[PDB]
Structures are given as structure tokens and as C-alpha cells.
Amino acid sequence: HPPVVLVPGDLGNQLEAKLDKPTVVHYLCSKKTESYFTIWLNLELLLPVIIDCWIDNIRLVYNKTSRATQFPDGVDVRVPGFGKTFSLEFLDPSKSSVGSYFHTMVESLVGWGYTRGEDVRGAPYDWRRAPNENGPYFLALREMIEEMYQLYGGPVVLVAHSMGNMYTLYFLQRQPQAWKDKYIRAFVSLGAPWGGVAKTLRVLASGDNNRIPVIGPLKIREQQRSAVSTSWLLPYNYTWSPEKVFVQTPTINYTLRDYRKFFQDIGFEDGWLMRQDTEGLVEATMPPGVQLHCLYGTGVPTPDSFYYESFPDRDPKICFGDGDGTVNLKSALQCQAWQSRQEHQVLLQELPGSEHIEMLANATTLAYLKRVLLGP
Amino acid sequence: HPPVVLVPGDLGNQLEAKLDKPTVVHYLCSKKTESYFTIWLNLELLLPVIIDCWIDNIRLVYNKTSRATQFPDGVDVRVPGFGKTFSLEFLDPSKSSVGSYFHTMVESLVGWGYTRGEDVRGAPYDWRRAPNENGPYFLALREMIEEMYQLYGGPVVLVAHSMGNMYTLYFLQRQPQAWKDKYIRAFVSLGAPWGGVAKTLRVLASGDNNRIPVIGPLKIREQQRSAVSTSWLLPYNYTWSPEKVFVQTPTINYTLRDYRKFFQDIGFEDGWLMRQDTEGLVEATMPPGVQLHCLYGTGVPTPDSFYYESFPDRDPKICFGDGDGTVNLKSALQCQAWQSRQEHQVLLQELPGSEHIEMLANATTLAYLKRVLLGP
Numbered sequence: 173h174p175p176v177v178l179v180p181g182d183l184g185n186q187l188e189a190k191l192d193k194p195t196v197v198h199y200l201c202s203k204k205t206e207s208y209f210t211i212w213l214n215l216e217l218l219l220p221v222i223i224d225c226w227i228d229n230i231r232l233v234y235n236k237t238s239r240a241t242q243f244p245d246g247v248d249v250r251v252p253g254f255g256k257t258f259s260l261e262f263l264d265p266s267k268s269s270v271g272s273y274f275h276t277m278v279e280s281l282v283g284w285g286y287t288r289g290e291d292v293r294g295a296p297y298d299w300r301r302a303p304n305e306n307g308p309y310f311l312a313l314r315e316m317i318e319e320m321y322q323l324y325g326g327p328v329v330l331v332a333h334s335m336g337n338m339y340t341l342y343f344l345q346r347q348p349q350a351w352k353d354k355y356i357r358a359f360v361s362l363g364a365p366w367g368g369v370a371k372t373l374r375v376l377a378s379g380d381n382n383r384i385p386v387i388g389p390l391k392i393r394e395q396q397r398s399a400v401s402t403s404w405l406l407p408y409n410y411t412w413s414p415e416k417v418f419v420q421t422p423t424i425n426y427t428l429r430d431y432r433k434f435f436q437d438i439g440f441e442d443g444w445l446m447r448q449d450t451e452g453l454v455e456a457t458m459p460p461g462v463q464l465h466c467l468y469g470t471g472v473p474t475p476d477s478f479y480y481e482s483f484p485d486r487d488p489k490i491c492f493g494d495g496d497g498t499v500n501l502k503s504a505l506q507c508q509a510w511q512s513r514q515e516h517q518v519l520l521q522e523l524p525g526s527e528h529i530e531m532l533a534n535a536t537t538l539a540y541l542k543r544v545l546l547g548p
Numbered sequence: 549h550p551p552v553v554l555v556p557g558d559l560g561n562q563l564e565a566k567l568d569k570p571t572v573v574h575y576l577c578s579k580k581t582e583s584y585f586t587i588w589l590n591l592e593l594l595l596p597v598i599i600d601c602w603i604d605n606i607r608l609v610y611n612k613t614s615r616a617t618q619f620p621d622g623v624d625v626r627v628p629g630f631g632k633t634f635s636l637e638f639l640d641p642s643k644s645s646v647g648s649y650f651h652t653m654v655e656s657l658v659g660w661g662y663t664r665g666e667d668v669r670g671a672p673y674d675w676r677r678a679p680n681e682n683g684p685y686f687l688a689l690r691e692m693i694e695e696m697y698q699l700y701g702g703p704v705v706l707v708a709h710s711m712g713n714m715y716t717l718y719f720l721q722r723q724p725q726a727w728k729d730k731y732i733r734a735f736v737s738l739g740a741p742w743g744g745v746a747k748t749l750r751v752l753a754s755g756d757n758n759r760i761p762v763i764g765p766l767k768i769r770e771q772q773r774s775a776v777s778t779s780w781l782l783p784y785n786y787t788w789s790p791e792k793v794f795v796q797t798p799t800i801n802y803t804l805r806d807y808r809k810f811f812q813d814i815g816f817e818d819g820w821l822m823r824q825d826t827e828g829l830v831e832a833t834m835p836p837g838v839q840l841h842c843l844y845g846t847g848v849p850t851p852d853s854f855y856y857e858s859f860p861d862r863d864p865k866i867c868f869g870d871g872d873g874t875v876n877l878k879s880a881l882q883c884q885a886w887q888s889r890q891e892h893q894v895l896l897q898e899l900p901g902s903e904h905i906e907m908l909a910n911a912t913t914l915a916y917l918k919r920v921l922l923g924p
């Protein structure tokens with residue numbers, strides 16, 4: 173069986189932090205820690221009495237001089253488990269039911285003959301950032317793939333979920349074709365947000381605590397705005413219409429042509445700079461150049477626009493379209509466009525009724541993956 | 549897949565003729581024919597008893613008043629199969645092994661999904677002339693390209709062999725940039741004689757029957773001198789050195805500065821006029837202005853000069869340099885010069901050991917073409 177590398181989406185692998193901060197926002201917050209602690213996912217840190225401490229540690233500071241993000245002073249954040257699977261099978265070190273992520277898929281692979289950290293390996297990353305600030309991650313990923321090719325006697329299958337598809341596409345578009353032809357067997361794409369997702373507007377405007385409801389919406393908005401990866405997934409012109417209204421107020425309508433004014437009207441102009449930094453990272457029409465399987469969910473009510481009666485501090489009324497609940501269905505059209513652009517096969521597989529996160533543990537998803545890896 | 553137009557080199561497509569001649573050079577020659585007959589390639593016409601009849605029909609008459617060529621009186625020559633492929637896949641209507649030309653490439657294209665005369669079409673022409681006398685051909689080529697763009701939903705890839713590269717470069721240099729940006733996807737150049745070939749001197753001086761050995765060398769020289777395209781491919785100053793000696797006699801040495809004296813010393817002053825007519829057709833330093841793939845053969849002994857002990861009626865001693873057997877390797881330098889001169893990519897691809905004619909049917913050549921048309 174071919175070696176496998178797993179690339180998670182946003183919030184899709186653990187993060188750890190160590191503190192030696194010059195100041196704290198509240199006298200209850202720790203200034204300095206003995207060693208690293210799990211900052212995601214750790215329910216203990218999200219209680220209302222100390223939720224402000226967690227925000228001050230997991231947010232990113234944007235630097236206009238360098239056009240890059242920085243951790244807050246004295247805070248280090250590292251990504252554990254690179255080349256392994258534990259930080260990616262469960263999001264909470266206690267391994268709760270809520271935080272079960274890649275575990276079901278990893279367990280299937282091991283059942284088929286794989287060995288964790290050997291011929292199946294995870295490629296976690298700091299999903300708060302866009303690819304332009306994870307240069308070292310992609311170098312590490314290339315070396316891991318070359319290593320796995322040598323050890324297990326064949327090219328590697330890349331399995332990416334959610335935002336990880338955009339990380340993997342960025343990686344593949346920038347490797348030479350001869351390298352991909354030698355080292356990559358296939359690219360299995362699970363719920364890829366090609367061209368952005370409409371819910372990104374709501375995330376920036378008023379926050380979205382859907383995946384971690386213990387955090388108040390205005391508190392998580394502080395962290396979600398500071399993450400470059402949020403603005404990176406704003407809707408793109410090569411998928412959406414420039415006339416499409418994503419945010420509607422009694423006064424103004426915001427299309428994808430109005431991101432500059434949108435960021436100014438929500439009091440977060442740094443978002444516009446991060447959109448500038450990230451809008452051109454993924455080439456609009458360049459295919460990955462490897463055999464591709466695009467698996468996408470349909471039949472799940474998916475937010476396509478938002479109406480605010482009180483903008484932007486009150487939850488909006490959501491208007492729903494088709495998709496997997498997160499990724500709008502029109503994103504799958506991008507996969508179909510790559511057929512004419514590359515020789516390698518591009519297979520599209522609709523998953524009716526399969527939700528964005530739940531497709532990772534779905535038996536139909538795993539059945540498709542099994543045919544790719546083990547053959548007929 | 550992108551539409552494809554095939555442009556042949558010299559001798560690279562069939563020619564047909566119809567006769568209503570006022571006189572014949574010999575009483576065995578036909579004066580008037582019922583319909584058109586194949587004049588190239590037709591081995592029946594080349595037997596020694598009637599070889600003079602064929603010369604009198606396929607030669608061109610140069611007219612000093614008009615600075616143009618004319619068919620002999622009462623002879624019409626037409627180019628069959630424009631927009632199709634039959635006149636260009638095989639040079640002999642019997643389809644001999646010798647005359648198989650574009651057939652292998654066309655067969656590959658059809659294997660990849662193309663359809664003869666539909667999204668792959670030939671652009672044959674009267675290769676006896678230089679571009680200044682094929683004005684209507686280039687008009688027909690532009691209309692065919694615009695038609696193919698509309699019918700098949702994309703810009704066209706031009707695939708040219710041998711002299712056809714100079715025809716295609718002449719065409720592209722003279723189309724507006726906005727037109728090429730819309731209608732041309734890429735230009736694949738196979739064995740292009742950028743800047744002339746040294747063997748042209750030998751052709752004019754004493755004839756060269758290498759591609760059709762049944763014709764005596766002094767007889768074919770009559771036809772090759774009368775063809776404007778011969779003088780058009782004399783070595784050019786922007787490739788060769790002005791001090792390079794192409795023809796050596798016990799008395800005189802001929803460089804590219806001596807073409808007028810050369811044409812006088814071989815008793816063919818009309819050639820000097822045809823060189824004047826054609827020396828400025830292709831601009832020396834103007835790039836094609838489209839994405840370009842320059843495929844050139846190396847490692848094949850290529851005539852670079854000639855020594856005559858008896859000038860110019862006896863076969864010379866040949867001195868060999870590097871190239872594809874016909875095109876000297878320094879011609880590929882012209883393609884490398886165009887990188888700095890245009891925005892579109894200029895790719896250079898050496899073909900070690902690939903002969904001028906044989907690269908058209910070579911699997912490595914077709915493999916390169918496949919990636920251009922179908923993508924990675």
C-alpha cells in the first residue's frame with residue numbers, strides 16, 4: 173500500500189504554547205509557564221473567568237512593517253506531532269468524543285496494514301496562518317514525502333481535509349512537475365474550500381463559535397480576526413459572482429468587491445492587509461498536476477449570505493444554500509475545471525448529505541479512500 | 549484539448565499540377581493533362597527518361613520586373629488538403645514508407661482525442677516560395693485559426709517543423725499582439741533553421757538529392773535553384789560569423805558577405821535577387837510574442853562548410869559540425885535570445901541524437917507535445 177500523509181484543516185490539529193509574557197491583561201492570567209501547555213483544544217482554558225487570558229495567548233499580532241504576523245510578546249506557539257498522528261487523531265489530549273477528528277480514518281488505515289508514524293504520517297501546521305508564513309512547514313513536508321518514498325518503496329498519497337486542501341494545493345503548485353511525477357501518487361481532497369466560503373464574512377463581522385460554543389461570539393471574534401487564514405478564505409472572484417451580496421445591512425451591501433470598505437466598517441483594517449497578503453497565494457487556474465480525487469458534500473444547508481439588523485455586533489439572520497454546511501457547492505466546479513488543464517486523472521465524487529467535519533469519519537468516505545490506497 | 553495546426557517544412561506536403569503548356573522541352577513530355585496529377589511526391593515522374601519533363605513543370609520562373617516568381621506558362625500548381633491532414637501525413641499518394649511524414653504525430657493526436665480536419669488541421673503551402681509570395685496562405689491560416697478558436701473553445705497550438713518554423717515566425721511577427729494573445733496558446737517549434745543552414749550553399753552550387761536519390765544531383769539543382777525558399781535559408785549574419793567560410797575552392801573562399809559573387813560564379817544571378825527579396829522577411833530580433841517551445845536536435849553530424857576540388861559541378865568534400873544533420877546547433881541560440889525580448893515563456897528542449905526529419909515521428913518528441921496539449 174502507498175505511503176499516506178494526512179493534512180488537516182483549520183482547528184484540525186493540536187497547538188501548544190509556552191509563556192514568558194512582559195504583561196498580562198488580567199491579574200488572573202499566567203505570565204510565565206513551566207513548560208508548554210495545550211492551548212488547543214483545552215476546554216479548561218475557555219472558562220469565562222480566564223477566557224481573556226486565552227485570547228491574549230492564541231491571537232496573532234499583525235505587523236504592517238513586515239507584512240507578517242507575530243505571536244504576542246513572550247508567547248511561543250508550536251505544532252506538536254509532525255510526522256506522527258496523535259496531535260491530529262484527537263484535538264483534546266483527554267481525547268473526548270467532541271475532539272475526535274482523524275482517529276476514525278487513522279484506525280481504518282492501521283486496520284488495512286498501516287503503522288502510525290511509519291507509512292502513515294500527519295502533517296499538522298499552525299492553521300492560524302496562511303501558507304506564506306509556513307515556508308518551513310512546506311520544506312519539512314517535502315522532506316517527509318521524499319523520506320517516505322525511499323522507506324516504503326513508492327510515491328505518496330496526500331489526504332487533505334477542509335483548509336488543508338488549500339495548503340496542499342499551494343504546496344503542489346509550487347513544486348516542480350518532475351518532483352511531483354516522482355514522489356506524489358495521488359491527491360485525495362476532502363471538502364476543499366476552493367475559492368473561499370461565504371461564512372468567512374460572518375466570522376469576521378460578529379464571530380462564529382459553532383465549533384466551540386463555550387466561547388462567546390464576540391470573544392472568539394478577537395481570535396478569528398487575528399488569524400490570517402480567516403481572511404485567506406474570503407470568497408474569491410473565480411468562484412463567486414462579483415455582484416453577490418454576502419453581507420446585507422439596512423444601509424450597505426457588501427460584495428467581494430467591497431472587502432476594503434467591509435474591513436473598515438467593522439473596525440479591523442488589518443484584515444484588508446492580510447487579504448492583500450493572501451489573495452494571490454493559490455494560483456486561480458493552475459491544477460495540482462497529480463492524480464486528483466475531489467470528494468465534496470452536497471445536500472447540507474450552507475450559509476451563503478447574512479442579514480444584519482444591528483451590524484456588526486449582533487448575530488445575523490443566515491440565508492442558506494447548497495453545500496456541505498461550510499463549503500458552498502460551487503467550489504467543486506473548480507475541481508472540474510482542472511480536467512482540461514492536466515493529463516493526470518481528476519475524479520469528482522459527490523457525497524450527498526455529508527457534512528464538512530463529519531465526512532472525515534464517514535464510512536462512505538473511508539470506503540472511497542480504501543479503493544484509492546488498496547486498489548480494486 | 550486545445551486546437552492544433554500543423555505547419556510542414558520544405559518538401560513537407562504534397563503538390564499537384566495541371567498542364568496546358570505552349571511547348572515542351574522534349575517530345576516525350578506531356579503538354580496538356582486531363583486533370584491534376586501529383587507532382588510531389590510521385591516517383592513515377594522522376595525516371596531518367598522523363599526527369600526533364602518534371603523539372604520543366606516544378607521549376608519556378610523568376611521575373612525581374614515584378615521581383616516575384618511565376619509558374620511556367622500553362623502550368624498550374626496547387627496545394628491540396630489545406631485544413632486537412634492527408635497531404636501532410638504522407639508525401640506520396642501511394643503512402644510509401646519513405647514518404648511517411650506527419651502521420652505518426654497525427655495518429656498520436658487522434659489517439660489523445662483529436663479528429664483529423666476538425667480540432668487538428670494541416671496548413672500546407674507551396675514550400676517552393678518564401679513568405680512574401682504566400683500572402684493568401686497567411687490570410688487563410690489566420691481565418692482557420694479564428695475558426696478553430698470559435699468551434700473548439702480555446703486558443704490554438706501551432707506545431708511547425710523545419711522551414712515551417714520560419715513561415716510561422718513570419719506569420720506571428722506580423723499579427724497584432726492582441727490577436728495572438730487571444731487566438732494563440734503556444735508555438736511548438738521542431739527543428740527550426742533560425743538564421744539559415746550551411747548546406748544551402750551546397751544545394752545551390754551543386755545540388756543535393758539526399759531526400760530523393762533517384763534524381764541526379766545536377767538535375768535537381770535546376771529545381772532547387774529556382775525555388776526562392778532555397779536562397780531564403782542561406783546563412784544569416786545574426787547567427788553565423790561574417791568570416792565563416794562556407795564554400796572553399798582552390799582559388800576563392802565564400803563567406804556570407806560574398807553571396808552576390810557566389811551567385812555570379814555559379815552562373816545563377818537570379819538567386820542573388822531572390823536573396824534580396826527574402827533577406828528581410830523575418831525580423832532578426834523580434835520574438836514570436838507567444839509561449840514558445842524550441843525543440844532542437846544535437847549530436848547529429850551536420851555540414852558546416854564544403855570544399856570543392858572542381859567548383860561547382862562536382863560533389864564537394866563535406867566538413868561536419870554539431871546539429872540535427874540539417875540545422876546547425878547555433879541556430880538554437882536565436883531561440884535563447886528571445887527570452888529577454890518577450891513576456892511569454894520561452895522553453896528550450898534539446899533532443900540529443902534526433903535527426904532533422906526523424907524528430908517528427910520520434911516518441912520523445914511526441915511525449916513532449918503530449919504534455920503541452922494535455923497538461924501535466
Ligand SMILES: *[C@@H]1O[C@H](CO)[C@@H](O)[C@H](O)[C@H]1NC(C)=O
Nearest residue numbers: 233234235236237238239242
Ligand atoms: C515589526 O517588524 C519590524 C521589522 O522586523 C520590527 O522592527 C518591529 O519591531 C515589529 N513591530 C512590532 C510591534 O514588534
Ligand SMILES: *[C@@H]1O[C@H](CO)[C@@H](O)[C@H](O)[C@H]1NC(C)=O
Nearest residue numbers: 523524525526534535536537
Ligand atoms: C456519510 O456519507 C454518506 C454519503 O454522503 C451519507 O449518505 C450519510 O448520510 C453520511 N453519514 C452520516 C452519519 O451522516
Ligand SMILES: *[C@@H]1O[C@H](CO)[C@@H](O)[C@H](O)[C@H]1NC(C)=O
Nearest residue numbers: 609610611612613614615618
Ligand atoms: C514579368 O512581369 C511583368 C509585369 O507583371 C509582365 O509584364 C511580364 O510579362 C512578365 N515577364 C514574363 C516573362 O512573364
Ligand SMILES: *[C@@H]1O[C@H](CO)[C@@H](O)[C@H](O)[C@H]1NC(C)=O
Nearest residue numbers: 899900901902906910911912
Ligand atoms: C528519438 O529522440 C530521442 C531523444 O532525442 C533520441 O535519444 C533517440 O535516439 C531518437 N530515436 C531515434 C530512432 O532516432
Ligand SMILES: [Cl-]
Nearest residue numbers: 463515516517
Ligand atoms: Cl493519473
Ligand SMILES: [Cl-]
Nearest residue numbers: 839891892893
Ligand atoms: Cl507563457
Ligand SMILES: [Zn+2]
Nearest residue numbers: 181334335498
Ligand atoms: Zn473547513
Ligand SMILES: [Zn+2]
Nearest residue numbers: 417476477491
Ligand atoms: Zn440572498
Ligand SMILES: [Zn+2]
Nearest residue numbers: 477490491492
Ligand atoms: Zn436569502
Ligand SMILES: [Zn+2]
Nearest residue numbers: 476477491492
Ligand atoms: Zn441566500
Ligand SMILES: [Zn+2]
Nearest residue numbers: 557710711874
Ligand atoms: Zn528543414
Ligand SMILES: [Zn+2]
Nearest residue numbers: 793852853867
Ligand atoms: Zn572549416
Ligand SMILES: [Zn+2]
Nearest residue numbers: 853866867868
Ligand atoms: Zn573542416
Ligand SMILES: [Zn+2]
Nearest residue numbers: 852853867868
Ligand atoms: Zn567545418
